[PDB]
Design a protein around this ligand. Structure first.
Ligand SMILES: O=C(Cc1ccc(OCCN2CCCC2)cc1)Nc1cc(C2CC2)[nH]n1
Length: 278
């Protein structure tokens, strides 16, 4: 750590403090996260999971029982960008470009059997060139917001799949379009009931095996499903169809990142430049 000069506090992550810092030898500006042997090995495997839509893990430093993760630095996160764009809304071609790029990043990690598990706007990082990148990939395996949590996790599935990331990204896509969180739960039951109130209480018809899940209760209220036309106006039919497939209850029916990239919604995808004031 004597090789780094702290510049400013980026924020407080799930694991520890994140600083913007300067590497004293290379002159490199990085993000430094201050955090068992199985953790060392899993984190070391993440150093090889390189993709243009994944924030680069430059180095892993284990000293005096403290673990430091050195990452590529980006100037802005999507949460702050969405707040800054609240009055006008993020233009649809930019939303579409960001969703396309995030799906490319997920398709890559998922092809390597690596899940994010905790996607949220705060860990999606953006630059002046129009890129968007996933941060904290694979750290979950190695107040916390529930808004993006998949229903199978809320229902107590211990062995969840890559579909949990598609659910989180669908929630984020809806929030970029409407300028409001889709399911802003403030407890696990409030989160689950908000999902049920919009998508309908799940049953054996739409989700075989749901009633056998660890935290499923037959006493859950039974709410009717709402039309996506009410949920995400003014999104077009291609976007609503894609979002519906990213929000399927059954993780097995939920669209994969690779199949989502082929969706007609992306026929006219482009890579616009965001308006960024740094
Ligand atoms: O999280 C960001 C975006 C960012 C940048 C600078 C910020 O400044 C923070 C507070 N300052 C105090 C005075 C004014 C504002 C805040 C957020 N970037 C990251 C993260 C990572 C790796 C995953 C670890 N890489 N890049």
């Amino acid at each position: 750590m004597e090789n780094f000069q702290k510049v400013e506090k980026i924020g407080e992550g799930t694991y520890g403090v994140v600083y913007k810092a300067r590497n004293k030898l290379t002159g490199e500006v990085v993000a430094l996260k201050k955090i068992p042997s199985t953790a060392i090995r899993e984190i070391s495997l993440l150093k090889e999971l390189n993709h243009p839509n994944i924030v680069k893990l430059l180095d892993v430093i284990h000293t005096e029982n403290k673990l430091y993760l050195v990452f590529e630095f980006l100037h802005q996160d999507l949460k702050k960008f969405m707040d800054a764009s609240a009055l006008t809304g993020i233009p649809l071609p930019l939303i579409k470009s960001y969703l396309f790029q995030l799906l490319q990043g997920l398709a890559f990690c998922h092809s390597h059997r690596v899940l994010h598990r905790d996607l949220k706007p705060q860990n999606l990082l953006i630059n002046t060139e129009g890129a968007i990148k996933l941060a904290d990939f694979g750290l979950a395996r190695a107040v916390v917001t529930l808004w993006y949590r998949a229903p199978e996790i809320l229902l107590g599935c211990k062995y969840y799949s890559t579909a949990v990331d598609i659910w989180s990204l669908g929630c984020i896509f809806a929030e970029m379009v409407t300028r409001r969180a889709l399911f802003p739960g403030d407890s696990e039951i409030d989160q689950l009931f908000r999902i049920f109130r919009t998508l309908g209480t799940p049953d054996e018809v739409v989700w075989p095996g749901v009633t056998s899940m660890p935290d499923y209760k037959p006493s859950f209220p039974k709410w009717a499903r709402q039309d996506f036309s009410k949920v995400v106006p003014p999104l077009d039919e291609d976007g609503r169809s894609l979002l519906s497939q990213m929000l399927h209850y059954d993780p097995n029916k939920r669209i994969s990142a690779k199949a989502a990239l082929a969706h007609p919604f992306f026929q006219d995808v482009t890579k616009p430049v965001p308006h960024l004031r740094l």
